[PDB]
Design a protein around this ligand. Structure first.
Ligand code: HEM
Ligand SMILES: O=N[O-]
Ligand SMILES: O=N[O-]
Length: 184
């Protein structure tokens, strides 16, 4: 179960973050890791489409090859804090699992600038028991975390050395699909 009420960035710039571009997860901190963790790569695009805030997600396990995409409409709870109902889709946006009430994540942008961000998410999926996940994002997929986002990790009272890097996974990403999914 999740335990954190993450605080959104003061002065969060929604239009800059939700600009239609891709964010790559470069490091993450799962507060309830499995006995045996599945080391996934992940990326998202976040944008507005025809007036609706949207996110498209990509997950890829470079060992098992499990790969899935999702599209969500976000609903605003406060500045920088959203509730997202997801539908699983193929890369083209065709629906594989429809939206349903128990399947949603919260998302909070704790820090962002033009190139980097720190987010919190709490995933709810059916009768699964899932915990908090923090992620460091970058606009460039293998960028090492710079000083601004690492300071934000500290200011959240987290220890960056606890985070797991995705940078030495042989991660590959379909960034064109993520962009086009925003409309689906
Ligand atoms: C590298 C960081 C991440 C890792 C290691 C990771 C890992 C996973 C795993 C293992 C699952 C499968 C859960 C299950 O069904 O048992 C999953 C599902 C999911 N994750 Fe992540 N995740 C990451 C980042 C994210 C982010 C940043 C978001 C939100 C923006 C997110 C949203 C979701 C959603 C919505 C599902 C369910 C999708 C579906 O069933 O259609 N994940 N994640
Ligand atoms: O990756 N199985 O939807
Ligand atoms: O673990 N992905 O929310």
């Amino acid at each position: 179960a999740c335990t954190k009420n993450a605080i959104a960035q003061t002065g969060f710039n929604k239009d800059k973050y939700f600009n239609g571009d891709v964010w790559y997860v470069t490091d993450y901190l799962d507060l309830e890791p499995d006995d045996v963790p599945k080391r996934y790569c992940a990326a998202l695009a976040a944008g507005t489409a025809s007036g609706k805030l949207k996110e498209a997600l990509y997950h890829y396990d470079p060992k098992t090859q499990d790969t899935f995409y999702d599209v969500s409409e976000l609903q605003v709870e406060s500045l920088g804090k959203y509730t997202a109902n997801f539908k699983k889709v193929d890369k083209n946006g065709n629906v594989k699992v429809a939206v349903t009430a128990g399947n949603y994540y919260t998302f909070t942008v704790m820090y962002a600038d033009d190139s980097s961000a720190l987010i919190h998410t709490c995933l709810h999926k059916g009768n699964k028991d899932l915990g908090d996940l923090y992620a460091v994002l970058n606009r460039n997929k293998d960028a090492a975390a710079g000083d601004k986002v690492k300071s934000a990790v500290s200011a959240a009272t987290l220890e960056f050395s606890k985070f797991i890097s995705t940078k030495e996974n042989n991660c590959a990403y379909d960034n064109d699909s993520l962009k086009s999914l925003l409309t689906k």
